[PDB]
């Protein structure tokens, strides 16, 4: 019942190979809906989900112009950052940022976000109050002082509490048949002998959306956290996700083990066992 919109910016310098490349992707929950790449032949914001295609040409022109302006802004930011850390012009560096809003079942703002990272390390972040900044080091304090002087936080606040929430609610309605549809996991347990002495039990969850899920193994009703191998949730390529959890069990003790599945799409949490 709760939802998020997020935009993700990445800028990567490449001395001797042109100017820094800029990429943006936009998500609603776990669904990518828009992209931009400055290395594209004719850079434009492009749709990646059917429900955003209905936006008109004025939408796409504004979104494209924002991304083209951001391409230049992030290139200046990267030049400033190089100086803040006394770095050579010879190295490649990365600047990332994410911003957006979370909304509850009633469509009201839960919280907003805007944070940045330099070379994979947190750099500066807007606090949950949408009024103050947390700077990671003395370089980020330079940015902070400059954004405090320009009252940047007030602009973000106005955006995150207004436009961000209102456009998220628009997208959720326009794409309600998918964005507000939870697809439950299809679940089964497989058995893989290792030796005469033990075998793997693997609990599968396939075809689910959104990606959030809980998969756990219990032995005699106690959780086997330290003994469970859990793979990262992975995209199937058809909007849905996959995950599995595995435990190594002594031969003949299989019925002491239970797999447990929680997902938004399930009428009730599942309890599964090996069924030879």
């Amino acid at each position: 019942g709760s939802h998020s919109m997020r935009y993700f910016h990445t800028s990567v310098s490449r001395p001797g190979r042109g100017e820094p490349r800029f990429i943006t992707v936009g998500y609603v929950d776990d669904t990518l809906f828009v992209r931009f790449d400055s290395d594209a032949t004719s850079p434009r914001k492009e749709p990646r989900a059917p429900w955003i295609e209905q936006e008109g040409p004025e939408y796409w022109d504004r979104e494209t112009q924002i991304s083209k302006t951001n391409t230049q802004t992030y290139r200046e930011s990267l030049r400033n950052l190089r100086g803040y850390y006394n770095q050579s012009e010879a190295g490649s560096h990365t600047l990332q940022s994410m911003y957006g809003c979370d909304v509850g079942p009633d469509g009201r703002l839960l919280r907003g976000h805007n944070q940045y990272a330099y070379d994979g390390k947190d750099y500066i972040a807007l606090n949950e109050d949408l009024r103050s900044w947390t700077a990671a080091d003395t370089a980020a304090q330079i940015t902070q002082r400059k954004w405090e002087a320009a009252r940047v936080a007030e602009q973000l606040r106005a955006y995150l509490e207004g436009e961000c929430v209102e456009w998220l609610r628009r997208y959720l309605e326009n794409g309600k048949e998918t964005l507000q549809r939870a697809d439950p996991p299809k679940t089964h347990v497989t058995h893989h002998p290792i030796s005469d002495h033990e075998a793997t039990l693997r609990c599968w969850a396939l075809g689910f959306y959104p990606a959030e899920i809980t998969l756990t193994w219990q032995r005699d009703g106690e959780d086997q956290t330290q003994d469970t191998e859990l793979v990262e949730t992975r995209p199937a390529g058809d909007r849905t996700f996959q995950k599995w959890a595995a435990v190594v069990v002594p031969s003949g003790e299989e019925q002491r083990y239970t797999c447990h599945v929680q997902h938004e799409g399930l009428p009730k949490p599942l309890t599964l066992r090996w069924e030879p």
Partner: peptide
């Protein structure tokens, strides 16, 4: 839709 005033760091 995106925020239109991303600032320089």
């Amino acid at each position: 839709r995106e925020f239109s005033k991303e600032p320089e760091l």
